[PDB]
Amino acid sequence: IPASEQETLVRPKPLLLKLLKSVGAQKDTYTMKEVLFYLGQYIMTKRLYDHIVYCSNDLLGDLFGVPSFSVKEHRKIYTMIYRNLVVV
Ligand SMILES: CC[C@@H](CO)N1C(=O)[C@H](CC(=O)O)O[C@@H](c2cccc(Cl)c2)[C@H]1c1ccc(Cl)cc1
């Protein structure tokens, strides 16, 4: 993962936005760095993470389309996030 990826500007789809609205200020456009941070906070505050995040229990599962995933497979995490947003 290159560092430039954090700068990508994105518009969340409603379900991603609903999730971000529980942890951060609402706005139309976010950086990827913000999205990952808010998802990070969402996961830790709700204790979906202990290297596995368990989310069949949670909206996050519907978002990502998985019951769980490893926090170390960053490529796959980006892919799952990307299908819930639009790059601007
Ligand atoms: C779930 C806790 C948060 C705390 O920063 N978190 C991690 O523990 C691990 C740490 C790591 O393995 O480097 O992944 C973080 C992260 C940062 C940036 C991009 C990605 Cl794909 C993951 C990052 C993370 C953010 C969002 C998502 Cl969806 C998954 C993991």
Curated annotation (Swiss-Prot):
Modification after translation: Phosphorylated at multiple sites near the RING domain by ATM upon DNA damage; this promotes its ubiquitination and degradation, preventing p53/TP53 degradation. Autoubiquitination leads to proteasomal degradation; resulting in p53/TP53 activation it may be regulated by SFN. Also ubiquitinated by TRIM13. ATM-phosphorylated MDM2 is ubiquitinated by the SCF(FBXO31) complex in response to genotoxic stress, promoting its degradation and p53/TP53-mediated DNA damage response. Deubiquitinated by USP2 leads to its accumulation and increases deubiquitination and degradation of p53/TP53. Deubiquitinated by USP7 leading to its stabilization.
Function: E3 ubiquitin-protein ligase that mediates ubiquitination of p53/TP53, leading to its degradation by the proteasome. Inhibits p53/TP53- and p73/TP73-mediated cell cycle arrest and apoptosis by binding its transcriptional activation domain. Also acts as a ubiquitin ligase E3 toward itself and ARRB1. Permits the nuclear export of p53/TP53. Promotes proteasome-dependent ubiquitin-independent degradation of retinoblastoma RB1 protein. Inhibits DAXX-mediated apoptosis by inducing its ubiquitination and degradation. Component of the TRIM28/KAP1-MDM2-p53/TP53 complex involved in stabilizing p53/TP53.
Family affiliation: Belongs to the MDM2/MDM4 family.
Ranges for region Necessary for interaction with USP2: 1-88
Region (Sufficient to promote the mitochondrial pathway of apoptosis): 1-79
Location(s) in or outside the cell: Nucleus, Nucleoplasm; Cytoplasm; Nucleus, Nucleolus; Nucleus
Tissues of expression: Ubiquitous. Isoform Mdm2-A, isoform Mdm2-B, isoform Mdm2-C, isoform Mdm2-D, isoform Mdm2-E, isoform Mdm2-F and isoform Mdm2-G are observed in a range of cancers but absent in normal tissues.
Residue ranges occupied by any SWIB/MDM2 domain in the UniProt entry: 8-87
Entry comment, domain topic: Region I is sufficient for binding p53 and inhibiting its G1 arrest and apoptosis functions. It also binds p73 and E2F1. Region II contains most of a central acidic region required for interaction with ribosomal protein L5 and a putative C4-type zinc finger. The RING finger domain which coordinates two molecules of zinc interacts specifically with RNA whether or not zinc is present and mediates the heterooligomerization with MDM4. It is also essential for its ubiquitin ligase E3 activity toward p53 and itself.
Assembly and interaction partners: Interacts with p53/TP53, TP73/p73, RBL5 and RP11. Binds specifically to RNA. Can interact with RB1, E1A-associated protein EP300 and the E2F1 transcription factor. Forms a ternary complex with p53/TP53 and WWOX. Interacts with CDKN2AIP, RFWD3, USP7, PYHIN1, and RBBP6. Interacts with ARRB1 and ARRB2. Interacts with PSMA3. Found in a trimeric complex with MDM2, MDM4 and USP2. Interacts with USP2 (via N-terminus and C-terminus). Interacts with MDM4. Part of a complex with MDM2, DAXX, RASSF1 and USP7. Part of a complex with DAXX, MDM2 and USP7. Interacts directly with DAXX and USP7. (Microbial infection) Interacts with herpes virus 8 protein v-IRF4.
Outcome reported for the amino acid change (mutating residue 40 to A): No effect on its ability to induce apoptosis
Domain of life: Eukaryota
Inducing or repressing factors: By DNA damage.
Note: MDM2 RING finger mutations that failed to ubiquitinate p53 in vitro did not target p53 for degradation when expressed in cells.
Disease implicated: Seems to be amplified in certain tumors (including soft tissue sarcomas, osteosarcomas and gliomas). A higher frequency of splice variants lacking p53 binding domain sequences was found in late-stage and high-grade ovarian and bladder carcinomas. Four of the splice variants show loss of p53 binding. Lessel-Kubisch syndrome: An autosomal recessive progeroid syndrome characterized by short stature, pinched facial features, prematurely gray hair, scleroderma-like skin changes, small kidneys and consecutive kidney failure, followed by severe arterial hypertension.
Protein name: E3 ubiquitin-protein ligase Mdm2
Source species: Homo sapiens (Human)
